[PDB]
């Protein structure tokens, strides 16, 4: 992890986004993490287009 | 049970019935062992918690 910071802010202030926008965001990245292994692992263009 | 103002009023008489600079010491060295069990206690948030 390059950043870490703390959702103090949250329960004090209503910028949820501390515990959503992450969350979230992790979860568009693990499609990539997939799209990484259809290619990585040499799959032919018929697989990843479903 | 020890709390802000609890640990507070400590001092308050360790200072309102000794002295200063006994005051002092104290003070420095349970700075250093409380950021300790600080760090062993890492508050987490996020969803999850």
């Given at each position: 992890?390059?950043?870490?910071?703390?959702?103090?802010?949250?329960?004090?202030?209503?910028?949820?986004?501390?515990?959503?926008?992450?969350?979230?965001?992790?979860?568009?990245?693990?499609?990539?993490?997939?799209?990484?292994?259809?290619?990585?692992?040499?799959?032919?263009?018929?697989?990843?287009?479903? | 049970?020890?709390?802000?103002?609890?640990?507070?009023?400590?001092?308050?008489?360790?200072?309102?019935?000794?002295?200063?600079?006994?005051?002092?010491?104290?003070?420095?060295?349970?700075?250093?062992?409380?950021?300790?069990?600080?760090?062993?206690?890492?508050?987490?948030?996020?969803?999850?918690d």
């Amino acid at each position: 992890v390059d950043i870490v910071l703390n959702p103090l802010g949250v329960p004090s202030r209503m910028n949820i986004g501390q515990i959503l926008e992450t969350h979230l965001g992790m979860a568009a990245k693990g499609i990539g993490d997939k799209i990484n292994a259809m290619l990585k692992q040499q799959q032919e263009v018929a697989k990843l287009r479903e | 049970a020890l709390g802000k103002k609890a640990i507070s009023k400590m001092l308050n008489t360790c200072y309102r019935i000794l002295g200063l600079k006994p005051t002092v010491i104290f003070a420095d060295q349970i700075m250093y062992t409380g950021f300790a069990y600080a760090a062993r206690s890492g508050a987490s948030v996020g969803i999850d918690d």
